[PDB]
């Protein structure tokens, strides 16, 4: 049950299909509201410590 390059192309096509959903006509509000925005928010850790 190994994979030929044709199977690799099919797998890559399925990944692209999953990524390209929720386009302009098919946008839900979870898609446009909840996204990945970790790199834009500031994180403060001054007032938190390790319990003993």
């Amino acid at each position: 049950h190994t994979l030929t390059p044709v199977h690799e192309e099919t797998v890559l096509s399925q990944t692209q299909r999953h990524l390209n959903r929720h386009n302009g006509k098919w946008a839900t509000e979870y898609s446009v509201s909840y996204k990945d925005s970790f790199d834009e928010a500031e994180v403060n850790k001054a007032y938190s410590k390790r319990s003993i």
Partner: protein, 430 residues
Amino acid sequence: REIVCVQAGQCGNQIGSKFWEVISDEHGVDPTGTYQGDSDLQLERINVYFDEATGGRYVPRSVLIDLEPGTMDSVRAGPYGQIFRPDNFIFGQSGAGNNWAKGHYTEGAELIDSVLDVCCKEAESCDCLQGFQICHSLGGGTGSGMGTLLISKLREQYPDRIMMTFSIIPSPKVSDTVVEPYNTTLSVHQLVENSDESMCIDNEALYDICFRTLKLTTPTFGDLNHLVSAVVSGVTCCLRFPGQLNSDLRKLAVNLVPFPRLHFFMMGFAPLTSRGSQQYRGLSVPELTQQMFDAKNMMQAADPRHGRYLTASALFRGRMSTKEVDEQMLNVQNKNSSYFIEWIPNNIKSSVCDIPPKGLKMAVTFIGNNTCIQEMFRRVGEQFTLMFRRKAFLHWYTGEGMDEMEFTEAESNMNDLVSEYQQYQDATIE
């Protein structure tokens, strides 16, 4: 959560062809049956109406019934006709004769076993079965008699599921058939016991929609059946796409039907507007709500202004705010307060779905439970009593085998339905 469809008679098969065109278009199914869509959102609920055949293809979970195959050959010959499974076409060898008794008792009992076998085969294949959906006219012959026969058999076999019908009823001004009152009265008698929810459409109302609102120069049955297929496909949209406030046929029934006999509803669809005017006004929730409650946009001859709303439901499709829905339904209830039954504190249910029909920014479908439905039944009962007192055409039905007692029972039951609507019309808090 999958529905099984039944299409009966000429009207039913014709409406069905346009419905399955609309459904195949929204989900991107080629007229060969091949999936050619462009988003996973189309695929992820395809099971609701389609079964999957091998290497791509989808097949529609529908039964086609008629007494002469001429119509079946016409539907098989249509542009999307190939999609239908050949084994799903069931036909006899002689017509209903436009007679209810023939359709119910003689050719009905001859065909019904093969239809029940196919419907059970289709139902038991489902992992969880939602209601059945049936399209037929009450004025015809095979539609009324065999449709109500099949409804009774399915109600015996699946009493815990939902039974839903869309039904065409004779216009108040011009008849298409002389014996319409008998077929209509007997069919309404069968439906009020058997059905869970029944929607009614007048062809006269679709003509008035086309001429007044759309200003069409040369309408055809394709336009009327397209309007109907649009509303039909709109009612199920929340079943099969995500939204902020999901809805279901059972939730509609629970909010619309106060008492089990009061299950006959009016229909409308809002963003109807002529191609010349469309450049002058953008879509927004006030515009849809105003057209939605305008009696010009309602698909029955009875007018709401002669009755009162017990309950109503609005299903919205599109990317939209909750403020406009909640505040519009409150504002409409407050300004027109005399037209709403006062012993229910809020008559309207709302639901919101993200995915509109292609090429419209927004749409709403409206379902209304209004006491003005009593005028249609009263008119049919008057014409029936005029015909029955004189034995006007009765020998055909009695020669098929019907007892005269059926006509008096059906008349009495329909008259009691009219009385019950009138009593709820004039109720008060005291």
